Amino acid sequence: GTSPTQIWCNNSQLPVDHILAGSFETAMRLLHDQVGVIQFGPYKQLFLQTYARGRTTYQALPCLPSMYSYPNRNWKDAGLKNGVPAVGLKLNDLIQRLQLCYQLTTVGKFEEAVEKFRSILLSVPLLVVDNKQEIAEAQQLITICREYIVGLCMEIERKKLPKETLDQQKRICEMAAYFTHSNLQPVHMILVLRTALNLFFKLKNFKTAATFARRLLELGPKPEVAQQTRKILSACEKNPTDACQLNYDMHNPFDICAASYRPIYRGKPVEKCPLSGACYSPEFKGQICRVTTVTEIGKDVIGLRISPLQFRL
Amino acid sequence: DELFDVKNAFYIGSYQQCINEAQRVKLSSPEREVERDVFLYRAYLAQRKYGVVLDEIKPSSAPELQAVRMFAEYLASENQRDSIVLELDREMSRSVDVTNTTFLLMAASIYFHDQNPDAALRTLHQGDGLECMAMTIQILLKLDRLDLARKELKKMQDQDEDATLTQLATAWVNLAVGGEKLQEAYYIFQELADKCSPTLLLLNGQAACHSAQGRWETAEGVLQEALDKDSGHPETLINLIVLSQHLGKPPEVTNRYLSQLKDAHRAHPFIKEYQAKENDFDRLAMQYAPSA
């Protein structure tokens, strides 16, 4: 007859369903078309893990091979024909993990934070989502992950680059400033602003520093920080002026190149990761996304398909 | 039936109980004595004490025992298997004897492992016994032809509704059916455990029923109890891995059970499949991966 796993495959477009089924090739294809995922290698743990949960086992008779049971999320209604695998991974689970990521960011554990963030980001396509808004949250969740990943990754590099040349220093300040734009939560956003302010201050680009200081204050950082910020801000006011011109436009909209960590203003051509939304300069197109690590930058895709609602007829 | 307790203990899954009782029972008949020995060894096979069966059953033993021993060697020696099947094929073709039911069951069992469902089913077709019917249904379920399975079940159902063997069979069909049926399967497993005794087999069956339905949490107790009795029990560990993920246990937990399974039985087909999946995944990765 037809195996239950096969039934699941026939029944659902969702990639997780196929993984549960054990149909890797099918699942990979779906991930490849719907999302960009060219490089499956980072996926392997997720697949096996997901795969393991798919079916239960019980023994009909002794000394014979054990039987397998396939749980269905719609067990009641599903007949033999319309079964679909039980869930097992949910949006809330992913959201919960996010806090741990936040914690690591605050501590300065950025490298570890990236891993947790990326782990969640990759996991999003696995989900089966019940309602339309819930789908939006998933997309939003992914966005948050890339934002941190690119931002944190940019930060790690900035620290690495050499301080010695003036040009080198200008580069650092620029990158620090770029971080400012990243959409993080206020606790983190404040932290980055704090950093940028100092770099700009030493740079003697006081005018720009003043703007950062004001933005920081609005956030409402702890009192000690706020006081310090006010102190710096007043100093900046004495000589509001930027000594050097930097390749940074606070006002102009940006898009940080995930690879280059260079600004891409407004309209200027950009290539984006189908999955993450990470942005890259056109040169990168066709390459593996640094943020996602699985995806192809240039790839055009159907789009994430977490819920059956997405399919319409 | 004098043997009733011994056999019943066997089907439920409490092998040791079967063995103990088998010894206590008195022969009272050359026929019965043979049946008793058959179950006694069958129990040892369940236990995986192959050596016991191979050593004790000797050529002089009754043909029924010989069949059991045949199965034992098949399980025990991987190398021997092709040779055994070949001989089995020869014996099956070159010899009519239907009467030996034990032979049919053992032979069918070998075919089943051989993954020659047709042959096993073919053999079972000849056998009249109630057990033969139960085995037949099980094979049909694996075949995923529930419909055929249902027919056999009723067939046995007419003969003996109350028999535990029949009840187990119904539960199986039941579990396959899905839906409201699942609850029915759950009760039968529960009732058996209550009456006879919770066996690892029975506990997992109950767990499977609960898991089929959403009730992951309810499943926890049965698996937990089963695990306590026997770590390394294949069905239990597998169920635990599945259960753990639904519960939201830490990923390490799922991994731990999986590793534990490997320790208990490196060979276990679940493990092999897992490995197989890993292999093709790597294979697939190369397919998608960019060239360099």
Author numbering:
A (entry chain A): 913 to 1225
B (entry chain E): 17 to 308
Report text from the authors:
Coat protein 1 (COPI) coated vesicles function in retrograde trafficking between the Golgi apparatus and the Endoplasmic Reticulum (ER), and between the Golgi cisternae in both retrograde and anterograde directions. Coatomer (the COPI complex) is a heteroheptameric protein complex, consisting of α, β, β’, γ, δ, ε and ζ subunits. Arf1-GTP recruits the protein complex coatomer from the cytoplasm and anchors it at the membrane. Polymerization of coatomer at the membrane assembles the COPI coat, which recruits cargo molecules and membrane machinery to the assembly site.
The linkage structures are at lower resolution than that of the leaf, so we fitted our leaf structure as a rigid body to assess which subunits are close to one another in the linkages. Consistent with our previously published structures the central contacts in linkages I and IV are made by the αε-COP subunits, and those in linkage II are made by the δ-COP MHD. Interestingly neither ε-COP nor the δ-COP MHD are essential for COPI function and the combined deletion of both is not lethal for yeast. While the contacts formed by these proteins at the linkages may play a regulatory role, they are therefore not essential for COPI function. The slightly improved resolution of the linkage structures obtained here compared to our previously published maps showed that the density that we interpret as being contributed by a flexible hydrophobic loop of the N-terminal β-propeller of α-COP, is in the vicinity of γ-COP in a neighbouring triad. We found that βArf1 is close to the N-terminal β-propeller of β’-COP in a neighbouring triad, and approaches the trunk domain of β-COP. While the low-resolution of the linkage structures precludes more detailed interpretation, the proximity of the peripheral βArf1 molecule to neighbouring triads suggests that βArf1 could modulate inter-triad interactions.
